[PDB]
Nucleic acid binder design. Sequence first.
DNA 1: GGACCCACGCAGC
DNA 2: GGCTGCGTGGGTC
Length: 111
Amino acid sequence: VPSPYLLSDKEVREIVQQSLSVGNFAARLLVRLFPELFTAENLRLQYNHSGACNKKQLDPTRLRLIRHYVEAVYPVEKMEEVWHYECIPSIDERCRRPNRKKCDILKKAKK
DNA sequence: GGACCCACGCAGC
DNA sequence: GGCTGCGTGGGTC
Protein backbone atom coordinates (compact mmCIF):
# COMPACT_ATOMS: atom_id res chain seq x y z
CA VAL A 1 0.00 0.00 0.00
CA PRO A 2 1.78 3.15 -1.23
CA SER A 3 1.87 6.00 1.28
CA PRO A 4 -0.22 9.13 0.60
CA TYR A 5 2.78 11.24 1.66
CA LEU A 6 4.80 10.12 -1.38
CA LEU A 7 5.92 12.91 -3.71
CA SER A 8 6.18 12.52 -7.48
CA ASP A 9 9.52 13.00 -9.20
CA LYS A 10 8.20 16.31 -10.53
CA GLU A 11 7.19 17.49 -7.05
CA VAL A 12 10.58 16.52 -5.61
CA ARG A 13 12.36 18.34 -8.43
CA GLU A 14 10.32 21.51 -7.84
CA ILE A 15 11.35 21.42 -4.16
CA VAL A 16 15.00 20.69 -4.99
CA GLN A 17 15.09 23.61 -7.44
CA GLN A 18 14.23 25.97 -4.56
CA SER A 19 16.57 24.33 -2.03
CA LEU A 20 19.69 26.30 -1.08
CA SER A 21 21.37 23.30 0.58
CA VAL A 22 20.67 19.71 1.57
CA GLY A 23 19.66 21.04 4.99
CA ASN A 24 17.19 23.46 3.39
CA PHE A 25 15.83 20.58 1.28
CA ALA A 26 15.10 18.64 4.49
CA ALA A 27 13.33 21.68 5.96
CA ARG A 28 11.25 22.20 2.81
CA LEU A 29 10.25 18.51 2.86
CA LEU A 30 9.27 18.93 6.52
CA VAL A 31 6.86 21.75 5.61
CA ARG A 32 5.42 19.77 2.68
CA LEU A 33 4.97 16.55 4.68
CA PHE A 34 3.68 18.11 7.95
CA PRO A 35 1.12 20.72 6.81
CA GLU A 36 -0.79 20.31 10.08
CA LEU A 37 2.22 21.84 11.89
CA PHE A 38 2.54 24.93 9.67
CA THR A 39 -0.92 26.48 9.90
CA ALA A 40 -1.58 29.74 11.73
CA GLU A 41 -1.77 27.67 14.94
CA ASN A 42 1.99 26.99 14.64
CA LEU A 43 1.71 23.54 16.20
CA ARG A 44 5.31 23.04 14.95
CA LEU A 45 6.47 24.97 18.03
CA GLN A 46 5.49 21.97 20.17
CA TYR A 47 7.58 19.46 18.16
CA ASN A 48 11.14 18.58 17.31
CA HIS A 49 12.65 15.59 15.54
CA SER A 50 13.35 13.58 18.71
CA GLY A 51 11.06 14.75 21.49
CA ALA A 52 14.07 16.27 23.26
CA CYS A 53 13.58 19.18 25.67
CA ASN A 54 10.18 17.77 26.76
CA LYS A 55 8.59 18.32 23.35
CA LYS A 56 6.53 16.08 21.09
CA GLN A 57 8.31 13.98 18.47
CA LEU A 58 7.77 14.37 14.72
CA ASP A 59 6.07 11.33 13.12
CA PRO A 60 9.00 8.88 12.86
CA THR A 61 7.63 7.38 9.65
CA ARG A 62 7.54 10.73 7.85
CA LEU A 63 10.97 11.61 9.26
CA ARG A 64 12.29 8.42 7.61
CA LEU A 65 10.60 9.55 4.39
CA ILE A 66 12.38 12.92 4.53
CA ARG A 67 15.68 11.09 4.91
CA HIS A 68 14.72 8.81 2.01
CA TYR A 69 14.23 11.80 -0.33
CA VAL A 70 17.41 13.50 0.91
CA GLU A 71 19.38 10.32 0.21
CA ALA A 72 17.76 9.80 -3.19
CA VAL A 73 18.73 13.30 -4.41
CA TYR A 74 21.88 14.55 -2.67
CA PRO A 75 25.40 13.07 -2.40
CA VAL A 76 25.72 10.12 -0.04
CA GLU A 77 29.50 10.01 0.63
CA LYS A 78 28.97 11.47 4.11
CA MET A 79 25.27 10.85 4.59
CA GLU A 80 25.46 9.96 8.30
CA GLU A 81 27.09 13.30 9.09
CA VAL A 82 24.87 15.25 6.66
CA TRP A 83 21.74 13.87 8.31
CA HIS A 84 22.99 14.30 11.88
CA TYR A 85 24.69 17.71 11.58
CA GLU A 86 22.88 19.46 8.68
CA CYS A 87 19.41 18.02 8.06
CA ILE A 88 18.33 17.28 11.66
CA PRO A 89 19.31 20.75 12.95
CA SER A 90 17.64 22.39 9.95
CA ILE A 91 14.43 20.45 10.61
CA ASP A 92 14.46 21.47 14.26
CA GLU A 93 15.25 25.10 13.46
CA ARG A 94 12.29 25.20 11.07
CA CYS A 95 9.93 23.87 13.76
CA ARG A 96 11.04 26.36 16.42
CA ARG A 97 11.58 29.43 14.22
CA PRO A 98 9.66 32.39 15.72
CA ASN A 99 7.39 34.32 13.38
CA ARG A 100 9.01 37.51 14.72
CA LYS A 101 12.62 37.84 15.80
CA LYS A 102 13.01 39.07 19.39
CA CYS A 103 15.14 42.01 18.24
CA ASP A 104 12.36 43.09 15.86
CA ILE A 105 9.65 42.84 18.54
CA LEU A 106 11.71 45.15 20.73
CA LYS A 107 12.68 47.47 17.87
CA LYS A 108 9.01 48.10 17.08
CA ALA A 109 8.16 48.53 20.79
CA LYS A 110 9.79 51.97 20.32
CA LYS A 111 7.54 52.87 17.37
C1' DG B 1 4.76 43.62 13.12
C1' DG B 2 8.49 40.68 6.09
C1' DA B 3 9.80 35.82 4.99
C1' DC B 4 13.37 33.16 5.17
C1' DC B 5 18.07 30.78 6.20
C1' DC B 6 21.84 29.35 8.95
C1' DA B 7 25.52 30.19 12.46
C1' DC B 8 26.63 30.11 17.15
C1' DG B 9 26.66 30.88 22.51
C1' DC B 10 24.51 28.57 25.89
C1' DA B 11 21.96 25.45 29.56
C1' DG B 12 20.58 21.02 30.36
C1' DC B 13 21.90 16.78 29.91
C1' DG C 1 33.55 18.96 29.63
C1' DG C 2 31.40 16.79 25.14
C1' DC C 3 26.84 16.54 22.84
C1' DT C 4 22.03 18.15 21.94
C1' DG C 5 18.40 21.45 20.63
C1' DC C 6 16.98 26.20 22.19
C1' DG C 7 16.99 31.11 21.56
C1' DT C 8 18.95 34.40 19.08
C1' DG C 9 20.54 37.80 15.49
C1' DG C 10 23.34 38.79 11.16
C1' DG C 11 22.33 38.50 6.74
C1' DT C 12 19.96 37.70 1.87
C1' DC C 13 16.03 37.79 -0.71
